[PDB]
Structures are given as C-alpha cells and as structure tokens.
Amino acid sequence: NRTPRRFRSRDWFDNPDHIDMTALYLERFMNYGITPEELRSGKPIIGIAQTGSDISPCNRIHLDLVQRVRDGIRDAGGIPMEFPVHPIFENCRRPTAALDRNLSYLGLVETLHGYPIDAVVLTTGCDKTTPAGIMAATTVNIPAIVLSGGPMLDGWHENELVGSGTVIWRSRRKLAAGEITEEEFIDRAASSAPSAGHCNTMGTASTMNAVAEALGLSLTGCAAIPAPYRERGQMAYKTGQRIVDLAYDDVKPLDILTKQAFENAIALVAAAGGSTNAQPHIVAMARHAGVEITADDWRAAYDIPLIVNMQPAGKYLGERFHRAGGAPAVLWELLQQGRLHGDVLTVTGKTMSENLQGRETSDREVIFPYHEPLAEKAGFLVLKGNLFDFAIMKSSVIGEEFRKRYLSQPGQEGVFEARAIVFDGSDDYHKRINDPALEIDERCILVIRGAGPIGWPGSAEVVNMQPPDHLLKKGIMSLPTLGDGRQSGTADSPSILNASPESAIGGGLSWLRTGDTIRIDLNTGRCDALVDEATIAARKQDGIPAVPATMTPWQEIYRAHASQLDTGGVLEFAVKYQDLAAKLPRHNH
Amino acid sequence: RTPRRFRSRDWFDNPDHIDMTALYLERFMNYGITPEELRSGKPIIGIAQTGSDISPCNRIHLDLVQRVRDGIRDAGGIPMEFPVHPIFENCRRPTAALDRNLSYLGLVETLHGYPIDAVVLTTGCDKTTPAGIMAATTVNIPAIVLSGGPMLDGWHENELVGSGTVIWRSRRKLAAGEITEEEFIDRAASSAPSAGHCNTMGTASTMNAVAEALGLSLTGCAAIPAPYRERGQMAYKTGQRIVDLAYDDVKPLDILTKQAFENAIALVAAAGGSTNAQPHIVAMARHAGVEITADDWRAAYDIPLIVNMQPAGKYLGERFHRAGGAPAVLWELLQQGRLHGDVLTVTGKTMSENLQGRETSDREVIFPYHEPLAEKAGFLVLKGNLFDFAIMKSSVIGEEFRKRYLSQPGQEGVFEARAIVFDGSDDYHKRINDPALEIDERCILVIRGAGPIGWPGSAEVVNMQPPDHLLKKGIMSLPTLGDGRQSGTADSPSILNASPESAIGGGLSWLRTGDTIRIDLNTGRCDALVDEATIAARKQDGIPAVPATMTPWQEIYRAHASQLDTGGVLEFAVKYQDLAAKLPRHNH
Amino acid sequence: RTPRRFRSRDWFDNPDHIDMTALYLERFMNYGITPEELRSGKPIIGIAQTGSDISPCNRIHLDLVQRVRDGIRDAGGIPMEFPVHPIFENCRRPTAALDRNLSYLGLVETLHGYPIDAVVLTTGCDKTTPAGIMAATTVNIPAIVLSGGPMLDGWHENELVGSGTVIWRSRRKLAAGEITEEEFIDRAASSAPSAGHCNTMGTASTMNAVAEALGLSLTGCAAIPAPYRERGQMAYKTGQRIVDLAYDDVKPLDILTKQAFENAIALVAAAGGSTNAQPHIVAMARHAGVEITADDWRAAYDIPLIVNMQPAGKYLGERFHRAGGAPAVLWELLQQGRLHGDVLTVTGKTMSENLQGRETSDREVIFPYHEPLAEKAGFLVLKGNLFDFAIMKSSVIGEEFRKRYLSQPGQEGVFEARAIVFDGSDDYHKRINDPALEIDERCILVIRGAGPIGWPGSAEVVNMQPPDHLLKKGIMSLPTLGDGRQSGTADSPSILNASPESAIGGGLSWLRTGDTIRIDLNTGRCDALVDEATIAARKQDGIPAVPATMTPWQEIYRAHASQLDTGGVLEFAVKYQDLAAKLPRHNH
C-alpha cells in the first residue's frame, strides 16, 4: 500500500539547502510535546480544518469528533494538525452568511498552501462550510476528504415532527392566521433543535453534504449520519485512516472533480428534493476546479423524480433518511436508471458504481422507487426572460393546492399570468405586505429585489415571502414568489430564485414596477414582464433602485469582486488560481 | 445566599491553625484558581464524575460536566470535579456487583476527607446510582443526582432493538439456528447507537427513575436520552440547584424518609422496573437508617404496569421520555392515592407540587392506571423451605407462560415443576443440552452459587433459556429460579435474589435435580417437596462448592457483604450515619 | 512483532461464547470506536488516570494523557483511559495515608476485571506511585510508570521557596514573630507556581525517582518539571514503549527483584529522599513477594548525600532535572559499585546501558560520590525497648544539631534527653508552650497515637518544632521521636515510623513525660531508661486512648493495616500474586 514519498512538509522539516531554516521550522511545533521523531520520520502532516465552535453550533460536534479523526490518522501512519477557519453560522450571521463563504475560502487556501500541510480533512456541516472547504482545497489541490457533521435528531412538538427551518416558515403563517401565539412560536422553534448537528430537514446543509458524497469527496454513507450517532464517530475514524492513503497515492481534488462528478451531484440534488442554494455552490466549486457548469446542465436534471420523503418537500427528517440508506441509497436508484456516471473515481479508491453495490434502500416509506416516485419533474427549472437571464424554481416543493390554482387551467397548463407586487428588500416587504392599499389577491406574484450578491450585499434568504394576512385567513397558503435573492434550503415555497443579473447591477428586475403583469411558462422555461420595449427604457432612465451603503471592510471587497449567482457568487479574480500546491512558496527568513 | 459557614472553611479559612490554612490553600491554586475563589466563602461543590473510556454508559458526563460547572458558577459556588471507582456493568468480570460497595467506600472517603460542601452525583450505568446515593447519605452533605440518560432507539431491519434484551432474544434465535454468529454480534451493535446507558427499562433506567421518585433529582431528570440537548440543559439547572441546596442545607437524610422509599417502590412496580432495584433500594434505605421489609414490597404487588417499554412492553427510552418520562408515571400513581405527595424533594417543592401538569402526552406509551398494560406488575415476594426471601418479576409473564403454568383449573396460580439444578452458569451451558436430563416443558431451571458470597458478588445468570430442542417446539421459556440475579433487561419471569443463598446454607444448597417445586403466587410460597428427614440426610453431605476468593477485594467482600434481601451492603457500614456532623483531624 | 493472544481477546473474541463476545463488544463502541479496533487483536492499553480538579499535583496528566494515547496508537495499541481513587496529600483528612491501600484495591479490580492487556500508571502526588505499582504487581500484566513531574521553581522576595519546606520554615518564623499571618499564606502560595507535585525532594520527588530506579519507567522520566515540553515528549515515548512491553510480555514480577529494590534503597539515601519511601518500598516489595528487612536499610546508611536539593540541600526540582536528574544520581552510584547495573528495565536495556553517558552536567547540584555534600546520609535504623524498628532522617542533620547532641568528646553519636510526650498533634499545639513543662535544649519531643491504627493511617505530625522560648534563644530544633511520620519536605532529623506504634501496645504506650531516653547512633539503639518494674506497672494502667473509628473504610483499615515497618499494607492482600494468570468468570 505505502510507498514512501517526499511530501511538501519535508521542505520545512528536512530542507536540503537551508538547515538553519529547518531548525527554525521544527523548533516551535514541539512546544506542546510533539517529538522530533514525529516531525522528521517522513510521515505526512494531515491538516484537520476545524469548523466547530461555540459560535457555530451546527458544526460544533466536530469538537468531539476531531479526536476520532486524529485516531484514524495515527493508526494509519500520519501526523494530525488541527487548525481553524473563519467561523460560519448561517442562522445568526448578519447581514447574511453568504458573505462568509468566500472569506473563509481565502483563509483556508492561505493556511493549506502556507504551512507544511500534505493532506487535509475538511470538517463540514452548516450550509456554507462544505463549499467553502472544497473550494479552498481544490485551489491548492492537495489530497482532501470531507467529513460531515450530520443533522440533528428528529424534533417533536405535541407528537408531531418539526423540522429545523421549516418550522419557522410554517409558524410565520400560523402566527399571522392567529392560530399560535408568540411563545408557541419560540417553543416550536426550540423543539426543532433537539441535539447537536445541522438542520435536520433536506436544506442546504443536508444537500451540500449529500453533494460531497455524490461528488466522490467523502466516504460512502458519510453525508446522512445524524451527528449524535456513534456511526458518526466511527465514520470520523475511518475518514482519518483514509486521508493518509489519499496522501500516499496522491489523489488530489482535481483528479476527482471532473465535469462528470458534478453531473452526478446535480442529479442527486434533484432526486433528493435538495436546496436551491446547491446551485450557486455547485457552480462555485466547479469553476474553482476549472469546470464549466451551464444552464443546460441544470435542464438536464429537471425530469428527475423526487424520491426522498423528507421535509420540506416531504414528510420525514434526517434520522429516517439515514436509516433508509441516506445518500448512497438515492444514488443507487439513479445509477440503476443510467442517470449516473458510475465509472468516476472517488476518495474511497473505488468507482461510484463500485461504491453503490448493495445500497438499495431499506425503507420504501422514505426513499421511493424511481419508477413509482413521490412527484415527477423534481429538478430545478431554469427560467429565462426579459427580467433575468437565469433563475431557478423549486419544482420539488410545488404544493397540490398551488398546482390547482395556477398551473392547472384547461387550455394553458404550466402557464399563468400574475400581477407583480414589488418590494425593495426584506424590511420593505414586512412594512407594506399587509397594507390594503395594494389590494393583493390570489392572482398576484410577490417580488423582492436588491437581495443579490451586490445589493444586500451577499445574497440573502428572503424570497420565501408569505401571502398577506387576509389571504392566509382565507386558507390561501402561498402565492407565487420571485426575487434576485435566495431562500432557506428549508423553504417549502416554489419560488423563482437566484435571478441573475440582480436588480442592483441593472438586471431586468431593476425596472419592474408593482401592477405589471408577469407571465410564467413552465413548459418552455420562460418568465416575462408584459411591458413594451418603449416603457422599459423610460423606467431604465430613472435608474437602478437604491441599495444600502457598504458597511464593513469585507463588504467593500466582496461587492468589488463577487460574481452573480449565475456563476456561483465567486471571487471572480480568484478562479484564475489553480493547483497552487505545484509551486512552493519562498522561505520566510 | 445567607451566607452560612460551610465545612470547607475549616480548610480554607481556619483562624486557629493559620499554618494549615496556608498548607490547604497552596496547591489548589496550581492550575489557576484565584485566592478570592477559595477564600470568599462560596460553597465548594464536588462533582462526582463517573464517566470514562472504560465507562461508556456514563461517558456522556465527560461532556455534561462543563454544563454542571457553568450552573454552579452562575449560582455562586465553586465546582470541584473528582472521579470515583469505575463501573461498567457489561464488561466487568466476575460481576459489577462487586464494585458498588467498593465505589461507596471511596466516595465516602472523598466527601468526608476533603473540603466539599455539597456534591453533584453523576449517574448512569447500573450500579453507579445506588453507590452515589449510599455514599452521599452516609456523609450527609447536600447532594443531588444528575442522570446521564439512555442511548437513542436502536433499529435493525426496521425493528426496535433494545440494549440487553437483544442479547437474550438473540440467544434463543441462535440456538434455533435462525441467525448466524456474526449476525448475533451485528444486532447487538445495532442496539447501542449513541452515548448513554441501556435504552430499555433495565437497571439504569429503573434506578435513575428511582432517584427521581426518591426526590433526589430535578423533575424529569431520569428519562432524557443522553444525547438530547435537554440533557445538557438539565445538567446546567442541576448545577444551579446544588448551590441552593448548600445554602438551604437540604441533606440526604432530610429527604430519604420511609415515605420517599415507599414512593420509589410504587414507581418500580408501575414502570416494569428491574428486580435489581430491590437490593439497591434496601441498601439505600439501610444507609439512611430506614427499614424496608418484605411487606413493603408486597404492598406494591397490586400496582399495574403503566409504561409500555421493553422488556415488559414495546418501546425504548426515547418514547418513554417524549411521553413524559418518570413524572408522567408518578402523576398516574399520585392520582390514585398511591403516592405520598407531601414529601420534600431537592426541587424545593413537594412531590405533589412537582407533579402538577405532568400527565402523559402519549397514551400508547404510558397507559392509564385504570385500564393499564397489565395488573399486578409489582414484584411478588416468595418464601419457603428453599429461601426466606425471593422476588418474581411479575410484569414480564407472557401469555404462553400464563397459559402453561398459571392457569391450572380450580387451582389458578399454583403449579409444580421438576427442578434441574446447576452450580454456576458454566454448568448450565455445559449440561442444558445433555439429553440425559430429559427436560420437558414442566421443568424449572434452577441455578445456585451465584449470590453475594457464592460467585462472589451476585451474578446475572438466572435468565436461563430452555434447551435447544424445546426452543424448536415453540417453548420460549421455562420457569427459572436462582440465588443470583438477572439483567434488568431480561424478559424472563424469574424468581430471583434468593436469600439466604446456597453458599451460606440456604435451602438451594440441598436441592437436587428431580425434586419437585410447588410455586403458588396466591400464598407467596415456593417450596421443594422433600421431607425434613431427607433434607437432613442431604445437609450432611455439605454445601456445594463455590470458587476460591481470587482478589483482595473479593476477600473483604465475602467477609462483610449481606444477603440480597438486606441490600447486599457491607454489614458493618450501615451503622455509620451523618458523618459530616463531625470534622476529621488535621493531617499535619 | 510476533502475534499474541492477549487476555482482552477473552472478552472481544471468545471461542465458546459468542453471546458474551457480542455483549462485551457492543457498548464499547457507543462513543465511536470501530469494530476493526476491538477485534484486530491489538493490545488494549489501560491508562490509570490520577489527575483531576481535586488532585492538583497529578492534574498535569489530563493534558499529557493525549500524548500517551498518541504514542500507544503510533505503536499499534488501543488506549483505554480510566480513573483510580483520588489522592491529594495536602488536603486529605485525617491523612492521605488511608488512601494508598484503598486506591490499591480499586485498581486491582479494574486491571483484573476488564479486558486490559497492559497499563500505563500515571503518578505524581506522594501515594499514587506506590499505589499504582502495588496494584500493577498484584495483577502482574505489563506495566510502566509515567511521572507528572515537579512544579517549577518557587520564588518569594528573590528567594527559592520549596513546596512543603516553606511551611515548616514559616511555622518557626511565626512563633518568633518575624512574619505576619498573611505573608505566611503568600509565602506558601509563592511555593506553588505551576502544575506538578512538590518541587523539593519530598515523597513525590522521591517515589518517582524510586520508580525510575526500579526500572519501572523510562530513563530520565522522574525529574522533568510538569510544564516542560520534555514531559509531554516523555509521555509519548511512554505510550509507545508500553505497547512493546505488552507484546514482549515484560511483567512487573520480571523487573521487581530484590536487586531492583536494593537499587531503589541506594538511590533514596543518595538523593536525601523522604523517610516515607521506607514504608512504600517495603509495601511494593511485599506485593512483589520480596522480603525487605531492616538490614537492607542498614546497608544503605553509609551512602553519601549527592543531591543539593531542599530539604537537605539548596536547590529545587528544576535544577535537579537540568543536572541529569535521577539518571545522574544513579550513574554516581554505579561507578562506585553500589548498583546492580545489569538488572532489567522497562527500556529493554539494562540499568547500566541506561546510564551510559548520564554523568551530571552540573556539579553545583549533583555532587561527586567522593567529594560529596555529606556522609552517612542513608536512613539509620534504631531498635530499642520503645519500638522494634524506627528510622532517622540522617540526611537533614544540621550543623547545630550535630554539635548540641551528637558531639560528646567521649562518645560521639550518643546522647540522653528528657521525654516530653504528646498524644496526637492537638495535644502538642495546646501544651508545647505550657511553661509548666520546663522544656529546655536537653528535651526530646515525643508524639504517639499516630500510627496506622492510632490516627488512623500514619500521620505526618512528628516534625514538631521547639517551644517559642527556645526558638527565640536561637535553638532551631530539638530531637523528635514518634510512631507517626513527617512530610518528606521536612528538614527535621526526626526518628520516625516507630513500629509497633503505641496504639497496639508498643513501648511508647508506657513511656511518660520526664523519662530519660538514650539514643546511640553507633549501635542503632534507642532506650527509655526505666526499669522493668515500672514498665509492668504502667502497662496495667492501659494503652493511651485514640479516636474511635469514624468512616467505614477506616474500620476496614484499622482491622487489616500492618505496621509501617512491614509497609503499612493490608496484610491479607500480599498473599495474592500473579492474578492475571487466572481468568475471572463471565458476568452473564
């Protein structure tokens, strides 16, 4: 198995030319008890990028699991080095945690490339830490492997399942409809988080962790294990064993993250009822590995049926999903219908197909068979028009009442027209949504603008807007929704999302006005404002709607270099840098 | 916050011996504690840590302890974590029942010998809960129990698989050749999915509920599964409360009255608890100076089964907790006047006030008293010419068993069985499938030499299964009798804890294979049909052999341990009471 | 290396019991251990953890245990950490001496009753080193000692303050009024500047040096200050080497020969070690089935004082380590043919190959054997009519003491003094300055009722200081005699460990205040000049009283502890040897 190699660590700890610098490098790494024989025996230094902390409750389980990773690395013959990254906690980070993925990315590459690190174990959980980690590891391109934290346990409130995130959106409706009070709202929310781990619905965190499995970047079965199961700590051990293997065999990210691998992830996202936030993230990771993912790569997957019976699209939560076989069971379903490139290489050292043998699900209540699924055409639906060149709609989440109301008229199905109610940001929506002067009814479409990477800044999860109270009290639970921002992966709103280019850089949403008529055609992928070419340029000369001034040093940088979610809201200058571990850096003294 | 003058101050602020105060304070600062911390007069809160790598059922406390410390600090105490002697019931051989008294001795020493004003007793695995309470009673400084909690539900092939109970059910399946040997090892592993203790209503679940029923933990502390966020929140609230108990000076002997033990006896019956609760409750009471007699157990025989949990019922710890846990069970008993609700608890309220609003939320799990899972779920006390005290696990009689033995016409509750006697569990596993014994469905399987003295430490070996050939005919259980114990996770309706045991000359010593036993659950009698003349002839042959004492502690144990009917205590130790009423000598 | 059937496999891989294998395996995985780990056949390495908040001298081990774990894993073993009974010498009352045998009992149970193949014994505070080694020997599985090391140097007003020694020096500065009560407390505080044990050549520093001397720990592991990175590097190395010892089956009884204890006895004398080493070394020897007699102590008497460390000398643990530590001190002993340099050690090499190259690098701290600090530094045994064994701390005889009592031009080393007799230390503090006693420079202060049965657990109360009026006259110390002990940090040339102690009828029971005692350091005699007739008449008046037994463990101790001369062991316990050669029964 193990044929020796001169790891880049050896350029610090056994440098041929400079023996002064070598001694300078060994000296302090021994100040808490590491012996010289450890740092000088030619074992690989395995970094562990720690994401858990008191400020990051979704990832904090990695504070206890890190010990299992250390044990794996040491049994298998490496030397572990745990170190931190910029923290990211989506629930409390303001203005939004989307700001942090790129900032964490920058700091991880500096560390991975700047220290005597050979391979890495990326610890992941909360929404944006999985892409931030993978993005950084590929730019540097040293052998990497993802270790997922896992979701929380099932939450219960009065004998009822209660999913993280989705409990907030359902409780916003019942509090408006006067069916719950302000303390039941807080208490149902608290019941949604019964343990350590990330959101327990199929939101961004469960999606991005299933993605890394589909991408072949973590061991089989890693994504779905709930954080407090001992399975998770066993998995953390085996991941520590595996990463030294990947260091010796020299299996880098750029060997794994081919376009075919990204197409596998795309397929998985759709079959699993995954989050629309997966789209900016999968593109961002693709770009940073020099792969181009286009709007046609998403249309490819639209006709994947929904097969996992998990909130927000379905019924159960992360525990039932993982007991049913989690991501490998979903991938197996797909592989059987030829929707997977089964011959890609994975960090297991086998091929996707080889990994998936035996992974047929064990709970058909939870993971449905491909041919008798839960819903057809569950993939994202990219939409085009005069309002934006690209956006996606959460097809997996169209309710049957929503279907009957808009997508069901006898001659024209999948097509409907609605009256725009436009809001400039989240605060705007909350202040005017119940203003009867706007006379809102069942044939309106709620529109929000200024919530993109530039407008907010960092795109914001504010598109899952709810009907005004008077409509909620009539039983109308959702109206169509559209905006240039995002929504929580836990939303059960069939929104049109991630509209690029956003309003704030002169996308079509900059000139739309309340009372206009929007025409949605889901058969053809088109969404248009019925507003003539002449009126359009009259509005355009009034200028772009206003957006808040820059507030922090990082926001100035972000607003300067961030792309649109079309291409993954990436630091556009940064994609250029590839395989940085090929060249060494200069000595520091 | 009065403040009072805590015994710790005799170490850290003694105005007689200033040299000693300097000597006592010096080293306690060598990891960064400031003098204001130890010299301000805040109480020192000992935390008795039971969790370790070798104690996986209690290891959750390695994490929880930081929540306890935060609560002590918020409330104005100074925490002081220290360990006790490790106990891990599954791997400790010859038996972990040796360890309960050894852990008692050490913990008494630590609490009395050091400047500790009040203790948080972390509990979990079988024996850790009585051992902590016994010790905290003898020293009698303010004390509170913090339970660890069960593991989460175990699943294998979409079936609920319970800690411990899987092993016994797997033993019957492997013998009937229905599962492989790596499948046995497999489903055992499926039953232990997380940190925590046995997720069935075993000894840990029973004993931790008993601590709640005694009044020694905050309401709802017993049942919270170990990995729940709620368990961490409970550990914080408990750290707060122990500081208060230090100031209000609420001590074990203030709480462990005869009524509180009667309440605990009610709950064990209602909850389908382990029969190992019987020795542990008699031990705890003795060390508190309270007498628990066989008639106190008989008083709880007619309490109905209330909780629908393996091994007696269906679900595991997670469902029991979500339906209300121990408070929901105590609420049921309170409504029927089966509880003394006026007793004081460590919450600062009476049991009755703690229980208001605690009616269950899930009647599939915690049945109503008046239409329950089954009636007469209490332990049934048996006596006769083979022992003066044994109990039968009533809550666990199945329908086939009640048909085959308990339903003789005109004579219901009385049956007779032909004894097949084994000396140790090795002897059982060697001759149970020897056809020479010609075992029928009307035999009683008997094991002896497994009590406190015989094994030594009583051993969980009485849940013997039928021979291979009976299991293939659909006979899943014969009646069983022994002077040892069984796992609280057992679903055998055994007659257990037979005192006096065979090794000190109880009736089991002269029983022979072939003898007939007449059991009658109406009279409470269990008697071998052998005439006094033949008994005498047999007695003269001497007592059957038991192994030689093999470690120093076994020798101490064999010399001082009492019989299970009196708690298996160190007999000399129960005379020691309220030790914190007297300060120890200075050490220099 | 060559594979082995470790005893753990009897749990994790049983041939005839797959049910028990599943039951033993399942819960050991509930915090993430994989089946590949517990079934691969790698040895299971116990780590006997002694640190905690209540044990500040050993607390360093809670951060070093990770180093130990990493080394066990780099070497192919599976680490299993677990606690023992906590011991903290400074605060434990009535004495930490009661704990050594208690800790001993629990660790035997743990090592024998669980699947442990080899153990690392973390040590530090006084009693933890003998207690560990005693238990590892009784069970006799491959063992190794990891020492926590002493605290950093203490400075107070630009002066070295040593742990412990600063207390006894301050008690004199307080009666002579040179310091206030609150600078006493700051002075003691300055003595403890970091983690670690006492930084003087007290019992901790002695016993860890004894451990290395016996070949039970790696070369140079003893004197490394706890906060040094050398100490975590040593813990890693120790984790590695214990795996090797497990495969090579290098058991305690292979190492602990009479030749090894003799090497230890030499090192103690040569280093000015604590008198407490004598009962601990005898205790370890007995548990190793080795006899160590008063003659073997005499054989070390004439060894010079080589180490310039408080109490006897000047420096503290830091300078001693920088000078090459116990290796340098053994190297001296080697070249003068005072070691058995070819005994086996847990290093693989023999003691001679261990010390090749270990000559001290600082002759200001470790002196050459032939131009030494002082001569005849070993303990000096004394027989007599007051006791059949005692020892005197020859190493701390100062200039004035030698002049005032040991320098009669006729017969040097003989003197006679008047006995002032106190019954326990409280008697001392309430009468030492009672002027009706007429105490002068020619009195001997005597304390009794302070042995194993008397106190109970021998107490450190013999280093009594002169009355206040003698201290103001410049007399810094008088002869001191007792059946108790004294801190190994004490600079008192006391006569200690008197067996038989008073409380069981030894000579000190009949001796009275005012009697004349004659000591002869040339014959090793100490006698109370009182005639046989007065002795018999005083015995009729009864042994002087002692406090009643107060805790359950005290009753066990008083009923089983031996005398300090035979090691203060539980005498019934030394007959148990090589326990790991028999397996315990299965628990279910």
Ligand code: FES
């Ligand atoms: S808050 Fe971190 S996963 Fe949703």
Ligand code: FES
């Ligand atoms: S083994 Fe610890 S509770 Fe059953």
Ligand code: FES
């Ligand atoms: S107090 Fe622990 S070493 Fe002296």
Ligand SMILES: [Mg+2]
């Ligand atoms: Mg999110």
Ligand SMILES: [Mg+2]
């Ligand atoms: Mg048990």
Ligand SMILES: [Mg+2]
């Ligand atoms: Mg001492």
